[PDB]
């Protein structure tokens, strides 16, 4: 979030996050974090969940163009530079960055494509900037009506209105599949009560039942069991396995 140098909407930057204790209060507590929109999860509940992997994508886009950063949307960003899955689970966080990323008739660092041959697949990236030919005429250089140059710059000038001011965006993609969990909240772990009807929470797997020493041979790669109807029958303790 504090990376002074953010990437363009095209060729966006992605960071693989794993094996950490995640505290989201540092983020949504700050006032300048203008937008905090979460899909498939609520901001209040983030600190109480566990995730197998977390991907942090970032880029700079127009202020009025943040609407396009959402599942299943259509448009320039949603189709040719950054597309989210329709069933995307995660959070989208954006805030104004005009004071940092604007120069009068400048700010050429951030670029974006306007059209592409085919819509990008979810989380797809295209770093190439080769000249786009019309198909009816072989080409090797820019020729206006044919042989287009795909990339163009916003040219953020402080004189622009909010609709065109640069906005700094980050996307927190989550995977909610069961154990192993690489990223988890700061929830404290209590002792293991056995042979008693207790309320348990194994890496976010909440329920009520009696925990008993299992006798079914899980293979080392298995860390969570299911019975008929997909009900959880057994689980391996994350603290002692």
């Amino acid at each position, epitope marked *: 979030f504090n990376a*002074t*140098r953010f*990437a*363009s909407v*095209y*060729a966006w930057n992605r960071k693989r996050i794993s094996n950490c204790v995640a505290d989201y209060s540092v983020l949504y507590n700050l006032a300048p974090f203008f937008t905090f929109k979460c899909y498939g999860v609520s901001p209040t509940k983030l600190n109480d969940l566990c995730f197998t992997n977390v991907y942090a994508d970032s880029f700079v886009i127009r202020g009025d163009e943040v609407r396009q950063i959402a599942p299943g949307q259509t448009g320039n960003i949603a189709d040719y530079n950054y597309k989210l899955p329709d069933d995307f689970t995660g959070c989208v966080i954006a805030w104004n960055s005009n004071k*940092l990323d604007s*120069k*009068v*008739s*400048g700010n*050429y*660092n*951030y*670029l974006y494509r306007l059209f592409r041959k085919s819509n990008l697949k979810p989380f797809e990236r295209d770093i190439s*900037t080769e*000249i786009y030919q019309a198909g009816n005429k072989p080409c090797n*250089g*820019v020729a206006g009506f044919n042989c287009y*140059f795909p*990339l*163009r*710059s916003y040219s953020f000038r402080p004189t622009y209105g909010v609709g065109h001011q640069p906005y700094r965006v980050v996307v927190l993609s989550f995977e909610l599949l069961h154990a192993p969990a690489t990223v988890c909240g700061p929830k404290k772990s209590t002792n293991l009560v056995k042979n008693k009807c207790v309320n348990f929470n194994f890496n976010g797997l909440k329920g009520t039942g009696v925990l008993t020493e299992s006798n079914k041979k899980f293979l080392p790669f298995q860390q969570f069991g299911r019975d008929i109807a997909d009900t959880t029958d057994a689980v391996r303790d994350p603290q002692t396995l």
Partner: antibody
Amino acid sequence: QVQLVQSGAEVKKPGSSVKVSCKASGGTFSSYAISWVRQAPGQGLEWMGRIIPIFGTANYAQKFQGRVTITADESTSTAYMELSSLRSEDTAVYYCASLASYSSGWEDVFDIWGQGTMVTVSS
Amino acid sequence: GDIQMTQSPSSLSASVGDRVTITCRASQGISSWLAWYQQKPGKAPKLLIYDASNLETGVPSRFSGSGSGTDFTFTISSLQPEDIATYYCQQYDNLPLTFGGGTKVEIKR
């Protein structure tokens, strides 16, 4: 790889106009943009203007607006700059560098430079 | 108006192996948009530090720098004979780029 090559030293009288160039080679011209830097004898660097040939935008320093003009083309993969009505103070070296801070990550730091071109103004 | 940088000290003299530092300052707080160049007499400038605190490809670890806002510092862990040159700070917060007055460093004896 990417390289820039400048022309040889040029000389002409005060009040005339000086043309300078620097070849662009390697990579692709569509990925290039050019700047122009000065080094007169016995002091530090100085900057004149900036051009992005593929975007068509150019800018000049306030001390060089109007007097300096920047142009480039892709057929020769070269950039041309002109300065008019030279004073004796215009005796300096001309440097063009692969333009910087043009996109994601590349910074307004001049990475690749030409070999230079000395110009002197005298009667 | 145009942003003007001040480099202090203007001149230096230290023997090979000694710790030396260079500083460059701007009139108003720039958002860490600063870089450093090395220029031998009559030679093309060479990029050493591009971001306020990052090193360019192939630059020896002998060179380092840090700073934010208005004042910045450029330090060398150990001077070497090749260090007879002038180093310039380049500010790029806004397009009207300025080049520092340059700090000239020589070998002491």
